[PDB]
């Protein structure tokens, strides 16, 4: 099956700033991978993104009732849906599971990557810090970044470049809106 | 400055005649509409207990989208989409421990059109027990992402592959994962 494909996408994006204080509705039409026309509530009418979209942006701008319904959508549609979904989306909180382990089983005095695995948390806002014997270590941090698991959980791996000597104690400190006190996990050399 | 984004994302694709309607919150799917059974499928169970959704409207929107795809196909001088092959990654949701149940995640990312064949392989053989998948999820660049899931028992004796077929790949892509001591 090699026959050509043709794709049409329609996206309505409700952007929320400082709760529902500022709302922006962005309606976007996309042919294949090219956005052709959009309605931005800050402008209040359709605009052709590419010339392919000019016939639609003109036609739709001639419909006054359509423009009115779209202009009011920030209230009847965006703010409504934000309210419907607030309790279990904006306010979803799942606490992260934290583990610390050496990436490699290497004896002391040799370079090692210490891994802080933070899994299963929501929302995605999170802060991970490394401490060597109580001192924060800002250098040599290597991170996968934020990983969205697709099932309303996140994970992240934050690694520290170390040369572990005997007696040293490394601690990973995680701050997340789901916890009132930062979570801490130790690994002793 | 942004705090949150809700996206009502729709698409229709020819000549596959495949349509999709979904709601997205900060990148995660709230629900989609099963086109065949004509009904709301909630990404998480509890969602359907806190909220509801009338599918009829989503199907009406899909019909308009099909009409518009045909109009735009003609208008563009029958310009086809350029295939964009997916990036595939395989991770565990949690650190692997022998005998402790876990889940492999196959991330299929940054691809278009939204048609893929995804199979899980254990020691080379297809596995379908307990597997699941998400529908296609929108991206800001208007490509798509997808997730496949495999619950499993970690062991030193098994290897795993996520096998992804997509028209942008001239060859099936295998992404490998194994527990290595």
């Amino acid at each position: 099956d090699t026959r050509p494909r043709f794709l049409w996408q329609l996206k309505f994006e409700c952007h929320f700033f400082n709760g529902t204080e500022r709302v922006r509705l962005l309606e976007r039409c996309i042919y294949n991978q090219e956005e052709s026309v959009r309605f931005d509530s800050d402008v209040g009418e359709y605009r052709a993104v590419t010339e392919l979209g000019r016939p639609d942006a003109e036609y739709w701008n001639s419909q006054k009732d359509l423009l009115e319904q779209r202009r009011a959508a920030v209230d009847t549609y965006c703010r409504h849906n934000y309210g419907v979904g607030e309790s279990f989306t904006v306010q979803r909180r799942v606490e992260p599971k934290v583990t610390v382990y050496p990436s490699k089983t290497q004896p002391l005095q040799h370079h090692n990557l210490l891994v802080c695995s933070v899994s299963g948390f929501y929302p995605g806002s999170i802060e991970v810090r490394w401490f060597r014997n109580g001192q924060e270590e800002k250098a040599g941090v290597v991170s996968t970044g934020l990983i969205q698991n697709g099932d309303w959980t996140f994970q992240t791996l934050v690694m520290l470049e170390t040369v572990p000597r005997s007696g040293e104690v490394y601690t990973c400190q995680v701050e997340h809106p789901s916890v009132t006190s930062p979570l801490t996990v130790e690994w002793r050399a | 400055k942004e705090e949150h984004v809700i996206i009502q994302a729709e698409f229709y694709l020819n000549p596959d005649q495949s349509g999709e309607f979904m709601f997205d919150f900060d990148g995660d799917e709230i629900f989609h509409v099963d086109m065949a059974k004509k009904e709301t499928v909630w990404r998480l169970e509890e969602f359907g207990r806190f909220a509801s959704f009338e599918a009829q409207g989503a199907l009406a929107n899909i019909a308009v989208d099909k009409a518009n795809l045909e109009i735009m196909t003609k208008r563009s001088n029958y310009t086809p989409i350029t295939n964009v092959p997916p990036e595939v990654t395989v991770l565990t949701n949690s650190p692997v421990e022998l005998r402790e149940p876990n889940v492999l995640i196959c991330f299929i990312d940054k691809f278009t059109p939204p048609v893929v064949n995804v199979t899980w392989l254990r020691n080379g053989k297809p596995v379908t027990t307990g597997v699941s998948e998400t529908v296609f999820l929108p991206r800001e660049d208007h490509l798509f992402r997808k997730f496949h899931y495999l619950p499993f028992l970690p062991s030193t004796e098994d290897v795993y592959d996520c096998r992804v077929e997509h028209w942008g790949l001239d060859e099936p892509l295998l992404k490998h994962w194994e527990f290595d001591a």
Partner: peptide, 15 residues
Amino acid sequence: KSAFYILPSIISNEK
């Protein structure tokens, strides 16, 4: 159990 609302899609300039 409140209900999510949709925006309707609109036909394009056929002409």
